[model samples]
Target chain A: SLKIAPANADFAFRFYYLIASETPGKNIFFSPLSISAAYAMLSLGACSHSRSQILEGLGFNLTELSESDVHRGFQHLLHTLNLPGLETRVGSALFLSHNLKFLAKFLNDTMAVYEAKLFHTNFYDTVGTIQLINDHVKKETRGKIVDLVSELKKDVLMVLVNYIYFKALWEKPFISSRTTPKDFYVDENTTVRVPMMLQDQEHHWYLHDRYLPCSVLRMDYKGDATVFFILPNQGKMREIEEVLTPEMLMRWNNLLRKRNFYKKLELHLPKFSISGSYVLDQILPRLGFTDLFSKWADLSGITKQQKLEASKSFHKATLDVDEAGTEAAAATSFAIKF
Target chain B: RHILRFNRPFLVVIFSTSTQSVLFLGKVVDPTKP
Candidate 1:
């Protein structure tokens, strides 16, 4: 069960690079699982060239698994994550224009396996439809994300939305009293005051790499989830980013699982919260997700009448970390038009 | 005895053991300001 799939690892790294390069020196926060799950759902509605492109862009080899098997894998993955004891909620929906009708098989499979719902909306009523979709996403993510869609165009055929929410407590909670205001180095010449959470008198799993110029610390959550904090040596962040790969992560994973050199360690982590939103339509094409965004897109499996193409893709995420634990929520929406 | 102080910008990653997957990845520069 510990043998992680290679495809997932590859996609994660690829996606990381795509976003990291675009926004440097910024606090990055997004759920790869949420984004991938959303794409996986969209793949089910794609045909031929567009379908293969989406799968490949997602790091899935067409030779390894059939289309149905891919969907099954996602079903298994989602079911496992949603198991008892884990506060994770992943929900998806398709908002189709009232004029277009979905293929029965596509609708049924999406609803049955992906647990996605279908809502009929009048695209002509742009304000009303946008409000409905935004409200639905807000409800799904417990209001962590709002206004998922500011407006919907009259030509829009359908909108696909995926929402994910997760919350977990730390296994060993940090002491609130230990937290103190400290100076954080933004660069060699600049420093700012910040609330630094501290944990003293404890032995923790740690890894220090001279070559990578970073220190890795694993903080256990209440369940099996662990948060690894990698702090690059001062002014060494760019080098670490350049050298980061799935192989490097796998090595860290192996080291954390096997090594047992726990000594007296005092940890100083920042208490912070961050939110990010992006229009992925432009960035995704750089990752080979081209056909879907163009008129050449073959999403005929979704509907029979109109030739639809993805016009807009939006993603917004927020994460909060404190002495108690971590809470995160994200929403992704892809709007298709004829 | 070792002291690790995150006085500078750092990268944070949240991972799941069961699935061997990354749950969240972040770079923290300012703690007081999100």
Candidate 2:
């Protein structure tokens, strides 16, 4: 059964955000990982209905994706990329309690096709990708301990994947000697001294009342998308997030302006990557996913032979930042695809 | 069998090993009485 193909793809979408956030210019690299995650999440039985209906209202099949077909689609994305200098980590797992026989068969065939591991875990009750670093870090960082990411508890199964890619500058650019501890304006009331990364170069910059006084700095990764740095004005992180709805996100993404500007700025982003676990039973229901996880729900689309009962998922991730670049990730999926 | 009822929406599935199939799929509509 080609079940793992779509599920794997969905897992990849969430992974893309982790990678995309780290890339230069803030533009997402449309890799197999990127597109697959977008597609898989769209068709997910639990969350897709609302997302699909919303996207459809805009007249686009945001969820329309195929695994085999999408592989070759990003030939251009991979062509202009350096392989060794770039490091990426991805992880995924599945949990099953009762239907191990059938689930194992499903996982065996899927692993054969994808060349991924299908192992047993005694700690996590469900399955999902946990972390994307050395095995030691994967085991060490397994739960939410940060502000940006949180794990739900209702998850009966999980499919977590992590992508960690480290890319050294093609040129030994950015003189480390120039990097110094400088006073950073985190907002109005709070200021902190952080190691500010500096590069003497000009790129597109913009400032508007779009969210908060955000300075969008762009960095290019070869031919891949640019990493966009959105720095909100003093004490406006929460304020910025409040007004930046998905619609605003789409509009800002579409109408992004490019201009040339030069300014000496201090940057002190935290260098820590962590993971946590949560169950969707509490969160998903609040998000209007009241049907799929329940017994009365229907998931006949993925497999008619087996019905998904309880889904306990586990997610683990980490982010690390040195003089090089930024790498952070998290993943957790539901039920059994095996 | 023990049944845990929740006021919120909940799913219940019966896994049948003999048929290698999910024998029953239903929701716990009411928690007050089941």
Candidate 3:
């Protein structure tokens, strides 16, 4: 019951490593929470997804927790996140082909549990459909993420999408005059100039985990959200990545909380806007989602028709951090192909 | 009095303290890239 958040965190770490391996020494960004919740809504129609592969892929132990428990766990998170947030929104939608009909049970379950909305559209009108979906996402994310879908197959049964938007002001806004353009070292000899935001003698938790040999800085948003920026020791970024586990996160959190919030910490963070786009269908197979993308897929649960398989699993997430605050938004789209 | 200068690459992990779960996780090798 209370383990859903932790389970989601565990899965986030697992998914991060796989993605991090894809590109090295490059900027990467994505909403792990949004991605996991998006897929869980698809699992309802995945039927014989073996429950084993998808749940385990999402970082859950099949034996320790049942399939129902996992769904309920996410169900728990969708509610808790906004309990006292600063404009956090995660919305789900299913766009069905105008001629086709989805199962009533699945629709009701998706709406009731995951809070998804259904839209009937003409899949043959590719450009129109693309515009419609992207337009909806842009509005949902307040324009942070646009063109969520570039194109879609004409013979698709339906498209499932989940979009999240979060906006929160920093507890103490960094004065605009204090932000200075400085050289940000990309490496020992490489450097790029960036507008670095500054805050001196800030009152927050700071931890120097000598064992991990990394320094962690915590920044609080107005409301209940916080972001931890980890500056791993030179030559130790990969080491920190390799050693990440759910237990280790708990250990870090504990260590961070051990000290008082009055530490004299100076945070010199850069103002950056970044986004991540991935063909998750190509990556899911590696993460234990074996059957959904194959020819022998068993997705008959969504409709009475045969040969229903998932053809596309794509996602895009964007985050903007500056003196005022941070805005993070993401959209995940799954296409059901005939 | 300690100063943390994030002049190089770093990791950003957003958490919902109430839920105690990670919301977003990523790496920024170069802040100028989108």
Candidate 4:
């Protein structure tokens, strides 16, 4: 468990930087667990070169843990998450062109280890196949993501999909009647009206970073997950953003757990929902995954075919925070063209 | 009588203390907007 968290934290921050740099001032919500699980599944079919790239890009080192060990770690993590009372669901699927041949070993390993399912579909019927896959994703995510794939190219040979859905009530739900419209300062010059939920209580965990001009408040969910609310001093957002890293994140986490400090908090958080979708075609290369999307990609382990490369990569995610609870969902798809 | 009032823009992080996992991180520029 400790081992998995670091790599996940590293990957989360790296991925966050890539998205934030590209689109500043935009609300982003994604499931890093979903994305990583998808890549782990893909690596099973990848040749050594591409596999190493995928693993390293995800903040994993083969020298630290063998490939099978990584899969076992994921299997253990997923099993822990799937336990009742967590309200989390993760599902992966491989949709292959009916005519394309795949290694039986790859199929078996994917199903047994990742619990991923296999679907043989006609790529020529792009519209119907895309609809079917989207339907499956919708079902898996409980309709949180309706249209994961808008269209699929006719030449697609394999499509890998991963979806994650999470729902959990807060340990202490906010009082809905107390929620009121309030002015929220977007910046020095801009202000907007928002429905702000209020929580007034003592004995809640709070952190004020002496090094950084920010305050952090912790809110627990019914299960293992906890939400930390960080508030930066006015005009100091950029300074705090510059210092976000996995090491810093780990430090904050460790401090929050060990410090055991709580203060009277007059907390005001907005009830909101956000959804984002990206192609990830350009972003993955920035993270050292260049060959997978190009003609030079080596995926001979999957089909023995010398010419197969991932042509399209898609990610769509949604998150909702309300007085009752929080609900989040994400779906990722990778299309390999031959 | 120390009170933590979040009346301005701030950053938010959701984390798991048990595993030291960063569950969610975001900035609340406008608490009214989302």
Best by DockQ: 3
Fraction of native Cα contacts kept in each candidate?
0.73, 0.00, 0.84, 0.46
Taking the tens digit of each residue's C-alpha lDDT, what string does model 1 give over A60-145? 78886777677787777777777773477778899988887778887888887778989999989888899999999999888888
What root-mean-square deviation over C-alphas does model 1 reach?
1.9
Residue A286 lDDT, candidate 4, scale 0-100: 88
Off by over 4 Å in 4: A258-260, B1-34
User: Which parts of model 2 have CA positions greater than 4 angstroms off?
Assistant: A1-84, A89-99, A103-116, A120-173, A184-192, A200-212, A222-225, A243-281, A299-307, A333-338, B1-34
**Candidate order, lDDT descending:** 3, 1, 4, 2
Model 3 misplaced regions, further than 4 Å: A260-262
Please report the candidate that would top TM-score against the real structure.
3
Model 3 pairs whose backbones collide: none
In order of DockQ, best first, we have 3, 1, 4, 2
The complex in candidate 4 yields a DockQ of 0.47
Q: Please identify model 1 stretches exceeding 4 Å from their true place.
A: A1-4
List each candidate's DockQ score: 0.69, 0.01, 0.80, 0.47
Ranking by TM-score: 3, 1, 4, 2
TM-score, prediction 4:
0.93
* TM-score of chain A by itself in each prediction: 0.95, 0.55, 0.95, 0.95
Using Cα atoms with residue i matched to residue i, what is each candidate's TM-score against the true structure? Answer: 0.95, 0.51, 0.96, 0.93
